[model samples]
Target: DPTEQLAYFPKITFERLKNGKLTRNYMILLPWQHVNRYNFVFSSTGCKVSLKTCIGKLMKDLNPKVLYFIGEGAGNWMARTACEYPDIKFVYRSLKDDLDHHYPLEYQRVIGELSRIIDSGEGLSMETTDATQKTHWDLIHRVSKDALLITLCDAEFKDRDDFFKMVILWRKHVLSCRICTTYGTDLYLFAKYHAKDCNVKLPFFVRSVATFIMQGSKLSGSECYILLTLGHHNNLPCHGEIQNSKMKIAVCNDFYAAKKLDNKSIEANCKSLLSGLRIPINKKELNRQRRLLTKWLTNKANTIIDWLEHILNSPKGELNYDFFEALENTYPNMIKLIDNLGNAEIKKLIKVTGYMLVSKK
Candidate 1:
């Protein structure tokens, strides 16, 4: 099913036939002179449209020696597509294979077990009675290096005490080996958290993109909105959105001032503090409260097939360009829609829907 995502790449189709057979041998090289020292060209098929263009552009620009794709479907397409350009050398690497082959034996076993648990949806309690689980936990308890324990629990793993301790020991192994893990939603979230070395919370629309792309499709505007929001909230450099104003945080000591002030003065100060900005929210709290919902409303709407499957799936509906270009165009509009909602409304939405804002400051 994921392999079919390649058909969504209109650019590939356009480029392939654009200049006849002459263009067939022409490879797109992405020069990465400004990217400091280029190591590897990483792309994915999950975000099929964007990843394809991103890879083509990177290969044309940076021209990295190695091209690494995180998933099977994407890697396969890249290999097939790049092969058409006979002039360039494109190497395909799969993260799944590399990690499995390179990871320690114990780690491999634990990962296998964890993966089974995740796939089976058979709760952690199922592992308690198993012999392999006991052995795995024993080894993890004694030598927890280059590992981490990720949890869907809103509270810190530390709150669980014993479970947290067990997780930490295994995590030590991951750290020793310069590998990290995540705990929420499964391996992808773990991988993302480890990659960023931070908590990997995301919004509803954004998470939807992650879900689709990780499975091998192109990223979408709604997804980008979530990413931009995360970057802004964390005070990181965002790839999109206007970046002029400095992010502001409330002064704890202001509470002291509020306590000493008159009602009118306190109200003014509070309003001023709240004005002109979007504050972040706890996504887990919103999900727990079930204050918001999303559905396949389009099923009740129109059914037209002029564009690719993935792009067509967007709530904003379909567009003409390849996945990435459409997403790029869609992003500004998405921002405008979110921006129009403003900080207060956005925050309220987060509170109601359990979605985090991942946009610019």
Candidate 2:
């Protein structure tokens, strides 16, 4: 009897009535703590009292020795109530590890500052025209190390050789930490660059939901699923009369890395940028543009390659822990293994998670 009791240890029930008389064990409790068990409990809830009653009645008929909630909020309440009612040992499961904590003060400061500048001509005038001494690049370099530096640079800045110099300098000083860079209002260009280089993760707010799902009491996986879907769907920017108004061209989309920006669904919004450009081209003109595009791409590729080669060919005495091997590895297959495992361990977190979560907010 004890073995049978152990086999079906705990049970649950909700009070109900039949023939105008209250009934006991109207709810069934299912036993769960085994190492491997697959019979699932589907909990349903809504404003409809009838449906709720039906779900309750169905569970009662099953006579499950254990109980669990379907959604997070309901599950959370179920878990709490089970705690209060000692007879109900396992009421709900938690998916809380994916939740993220709130953003730090520093991120608030960064976003706030960028927002202010982007919103008003006054802020832009003060930073750009009046603060000529501090070039846009200079102002960008001085900001927090873990910031995305996007220069709404004029053609004057682009034509100059100093453009590449500034990029190199930014990489040297500002981007030594968690930084990403990009150039363009063109959605396709931004997508291409982000996919190719600067591999950046999604925004802290987006990632935070995953953390919330994994940890919060009032939350569940279904809630996370719904919230994540809604959050993305609502977060769209408007452009003037563009054929595809719903483009996924965010600041992160342009400059960040593809592996880091791992939501393929988000990339779906970037298909229709060039259609609006409306630049018709004859065969001769198209051929000329292709040649120019090839030359530009070749130069851009060589620039990074040269920079990486320079760092690697340096004397052994110059080798230091701060050196980033990633920048040096031009071809993806080239594996330059560092023999010092302990040193790699110490630096592992930096290369992986970086200062995004580690540094002061």
Candidate 3:
């Protein structure tokens, strides 16, 4: 049934370039059920291709009347895409602070270059100084027919009034557009929530896995390829979706479960356990209680050490189930030892030691 559902859409392909050199190919196909959310065919090629060449090819094929770009990180490409497809109107919205700090100056420089290419008199202003005073409705009303409306400095701007404005605009205007990001599902969730709040319908979400498949190709020196329509999200998924496959093992302090227990490991674990319990006595009394507990453990060490050796030599490096079953049978003696202990420190140490003995393997 899932395969049948995917069969309704046409396969879309495009070229990709990296660092101004032809580098890859990409293709995608959307599910028929959600095609209404994104009416345009979605595809792209290359990592470093110019926006002019990329968008020009799409325009020649699709003849899209209007385009909307929603993030500043991708603004350089969007601006060039808009310029190349001058016949098509563009509306761009970017958050100024969202620009990466690694190349902030370089990004600003490109925005300046794009300003000339797009020929917008206001230039590419990367600030939210005006958003604080304006509402989304006001901005939506200002988007002139066949004009590009860009929002700059939109990082963490979702809590602002202007974000809700864009939500409302998308809800009402229902423009054909594509959202691209390396941020993965987080960006998708942001858009999905706003769309859901406004009761705006959306298409099935698609995840494409891309890899540099070839070092050299006849068409491009390097080739980056992607396979699409590979996955979808019907509902909000959590981090738990990827199950933790780690082995369910006992805590390190659980000495009975230890594979290779020595006198040192036992002493260390005992010290750690007793360190948390209060002595409830003077320094001299505390020292006496510690000595008593240490002597009791030292006497029991021979039997405990032999038992640990048996477990370590067991098959498949796992503790024998009968080890605890036998301990449970002898547990009343452990209770009696604790009851006989007069000192608070001795009693506390015995109680904690009993816990370590019964610890799950």
Most accurate candidate by TM-score: 3
> After best superposition, candidate 1 residue 283: deviation in angstroms?
47
Please, what is the whole-model Cα lDDT of each candidate in the order they appear? Answer: 0.23, 0.22, 0.29
Candidates ranked, most accurate by TM-score first: 3, 1, 2
Tens-digit per-residue lDDT, 255-359, candidate 3: 122122223323433454343222222345334544555456544433333333332333332222233333324443444433444443332333333323333
User: How many angstroms is residue 70 displaced in model 3 relative to the true structure, after the best TM-score fit?
Assistant: 2.1
For candidate 2, write residues 31-79 as lDDT tens digits: 1111011111111111101112223343344333333221122221232
Q: After best superposition, candidate 1 residue 108: deviation in angstroms? A: 26
Clashes of 1: 42
Looking at candidate 2, the ten consecutive residues that score lowest on lDDT are 186-195
| Positional deviation of residue 159's Cα in model 3 after best superposition, in angstroms | 8.0
Q: How many angstroms is residue 294 displaced in model 2 relative to the true structure, after the best TM-score fit?
A: 51
Candidate with the larger lDDT of 1 and 2: 1
Better of 2 and 3 by lDDT: 3
State the displacement of the C-alpha of residue 116, model 2, in Å, after optimal TM-score superposition. 7.4
Each model's TM-score, in the order given? 0.21, 0.15, 0.26
- Model 2 residue 230 CA deviation (Å) reads 35
Estimate candidate 3's alpha-carbon lDDT, on a 0 to 1 scale: 0.29
